[PDB]
């Protein structure tokens, strides 16, 4: 089949130089013209760039947002896409996706994950919500990176249970509000993979 | 939570030990005394027993006077007694700081309450149930039974705990299955592969589709299922004139 | 210039039922060949972008006949004959006629189709701890609440409110919002929404 399976995502500080590689396995790689399309965290998809066909030139087409910053390349006797990421800045935090045409964008391959933040690797600061007199919650403010998995009554209820997709302050950080809805006393075991931090909440109004 | 707990533990060896003897539960909660008291009954015949030292030694010699399988435990420790029970610290949440209770997923069993609980009580406290409680292995192997549970697997080196599984069904109506783990003595996979025959022998699902994966076999034909034929025949009933 | 092109931002699909999204471009996209320089793609919830029709009408092979493909110069149309609970989505209206193309269009925000919910806003002022550490967050949590349209605001103003949304669940196929007031030392010393669900402004403060 043609799968365009990527790879080259992580975590690195504004102003670094990262590679996106795109395995194109199951056409001529030759005759399309690979693309890259940035989707920034739960927007609209924006295209940075595409390499013409080495037939049609090879004239590398790129973006009024990331021009003199980014180039494109490719192989056929190696058969790989290039994205060569240089002097990151925020904006870059994003799944950037590679797909098999400059204006038919077709298979666009998984989605390589790159983040682009300032901080550093963090366990929560686990910040329970207290009911009015109702719903039951609690933050994990102030993690990084992401994963992050919240349970309540550690893995017992699941019904009612909101895990707000999590989101960046201005600091780079995650904040996550997970947050149950059952009149009552419950427990919310928050476990951050990257530095294993599992951090437990107990909440009373 | 084994290494912690396995580290400071290694500090109550010379006052008390363990034992494992295949005795009924009567005569011995009935001679018990001194410091001495059952850690787990693994069966009606099978009870393993924590006692303090110069009596738990003539515990398993009040089982050579009566001839059963002799064990000093080599690895003998304190559990299940107080001894271990006054580290209200490292023995009772050092070992097991963090944790994740899971849900229903698939039933597992717990023994210190003596039937099926879901797993969200393992962690610290549950060791501290295996060093304050007894354990009712059997109880928990009755329940096992009870919710349609028959071929037992010994996750060891050496069946002492199958051989009193056997033990469950020498006066259990529902005679239950208990593979013969790696015997004392066994460590290669010839002897694996013969357990898996057993397991397989026994009704122990195999997926077969797993042990031929890195073997890179081929199927070839085998002669199919021979059918043990009777005579059904149903004659047209009648007879002529 | 530029092909502007828009579309039903917010249509609700309910499962077994034919929909329809529109596109409407500023300038023409039907090129002098006769065929229209239209693309549909769809990106489902946490996936790939997939191609579902090119050149207006004709669609992508692996894709479901479902989507069917039409359009003049500049209105257009996706017509799903069948919204099953993969139909679900961003559906993107994405010219060919003028490359480059910076964006692939705000994209049509497909949901999951019931009557309108109740906004359970559910005011949390920040535990005390939390101004014992140095921050403030009261969370103004809505919960079950179908379209997710809600302005959600913080008086007695707003400005310092960063938005938590969640995508459309199964069984109640409501949404639910995390509006976080993350918040400095001595300011601390109300949330309100004005969804559809609704009409009369709830102000309930912590």
């Known amino acids: 089949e043609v799968q365009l399976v990527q790879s080259g995502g992580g975590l690195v500080q504004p102003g670094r130089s990262l590679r996106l590689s795109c395995t194109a396995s199951?056409?001529?790689?030759?005759?399309?013209?690979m693309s890259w399309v940035r989707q920034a965290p739960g927007k609209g998809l924006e295209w940075v760039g595409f390499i013409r066909s080495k037939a049609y030139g090879g004239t590398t087409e790129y973006a009024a947002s990331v021009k003199g910053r980014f180039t494109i390349s490719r192989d056929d006797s190696k058969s790989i896409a290039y994205l060569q990421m240089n002097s990151l800045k925020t904006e870059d935090t994003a799944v950037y996706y590679c797909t098999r045409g400059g204006t038919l964008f077709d298979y666009w391959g998984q989605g390589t994950l790159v983040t682009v933040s300032s901080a550093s690797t963090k366990g929560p600061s686990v910040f329970p919500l207290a009911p009015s007199s109702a719903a039951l919650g609690c933050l994990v403010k102030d993690y990084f990176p992401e994963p992050v998995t919240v349970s309540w009554n550690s893995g017992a209820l699941t019904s009612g249970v909101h895990t707000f997709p999590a989101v960046l302050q201005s600091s780079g950080l995650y904040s996550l509000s997970s947050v149950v809805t059952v009149p009552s006393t419950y427990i919310c075991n928050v476990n951050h993979k990257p530095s294993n931090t599992k951090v437990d909440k107990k909440v009373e109004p | 939570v084994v290494a912690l707990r396995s580290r400071v533990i290694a500090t109550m060896p010379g006052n008390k030990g363990m034992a494992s003897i295949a005795a009924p539960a009567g005569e011995v909660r009935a001679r018990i005394g001194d410091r001495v008291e059952i850690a787990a009954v693994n069966g009606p015949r099978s009870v393993v027993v924590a006692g303090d030292s110069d009596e738990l030694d003539r515990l398993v010699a009040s089982c050579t006077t009566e001839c059963i399988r002799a064990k000093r435990l080599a690895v003998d420790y304190a559990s299940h007694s107080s001894h271990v029970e006054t580290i209200r610290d490292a023995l009772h949440a050092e070992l097991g700081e963090d944790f994740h209770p899971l849900p229903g997923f698939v039933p597992f069993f717990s023994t210190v309450t003596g039937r099926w609980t879901q797993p969200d009580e393992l962690d610290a406290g549950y060791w501290y149930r295996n060093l304050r409680r007894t354990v009712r292995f059997a109880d928990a192997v009755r329940a096992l039974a009870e919710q349609g549970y028959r071929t037992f697997l010994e996750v060891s080196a050496h069946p002492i705990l199958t051989a009193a599984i056997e033990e469950i069904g020498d006066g259990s109506g529902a005679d239950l299955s208990a593979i013969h783990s790696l015997r004392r003595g066994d460590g290669s996979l010839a002897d694996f592969g013969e357990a898996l025959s057993r397991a397989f022998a026994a009704g122990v699902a195999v997926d077969w589709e797993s042990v031929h994966l890195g073997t890179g076999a081929r199927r070839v034909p085998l002669p199919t299922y021979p059918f043990q034929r009777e005579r059904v025949w149903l004659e047209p009933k009648p007879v002529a004139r | 210039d530029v092909v502007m092109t828009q579309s039903p931002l917010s249509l609700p699909v309910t499962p077994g039922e034919p929909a329809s999204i529109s596109c409407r471009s500023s300038?023409?996209?039907?090129?002098?060949?006769?065929?229209?320089?239209l693309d549909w793609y769809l990106q489902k919830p946490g996936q790939s972008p997939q191609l579902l029709i090119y050149?207006?009408?004709n669609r992508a092979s692996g894709v479901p006949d479902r989507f069917s493909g039409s359009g003049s110069g500049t209105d257009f149309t996706l017509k799903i004959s069948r919204v099953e609970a993969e139909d679900v989505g961003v559906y993107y209206c994405?010219?060919?006629?003028?490359?480059?193309?910076?964006?692939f269009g705000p994209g049509t925000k497909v949901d999951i189709k019931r009557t309108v919910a109740a906004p359970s806003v559910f005011i949390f002022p920040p535990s005390d701890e939390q101004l014992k550490s140095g921050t403030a967050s009261v969370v103004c949590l809505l919960n079950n609440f179908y379209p997710r349209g809600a302005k959600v605001q913080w008086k007695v103003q707003s400005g310092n409110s960063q938005e938590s949304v969640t995508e459309q669940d199964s069984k109640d196929s409501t949404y639910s919002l995390s509006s976080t007031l993350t918040l400095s030392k001595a300011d601390y010393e109300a949330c309100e929404v004005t969804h559809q669900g609704l009409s009369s402004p709830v102000t309930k403060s912590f």
């Open positions: 300038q023409s996209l039907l090129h002098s060949n006769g065929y229209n320089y």
């Open positions: 994405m010219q060919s006629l003028q490359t480059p193309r910076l964006t």
């Open positions: 199951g056409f001529t790689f030759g005759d399309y013209a």
């Open positions: 050149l207006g009408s």
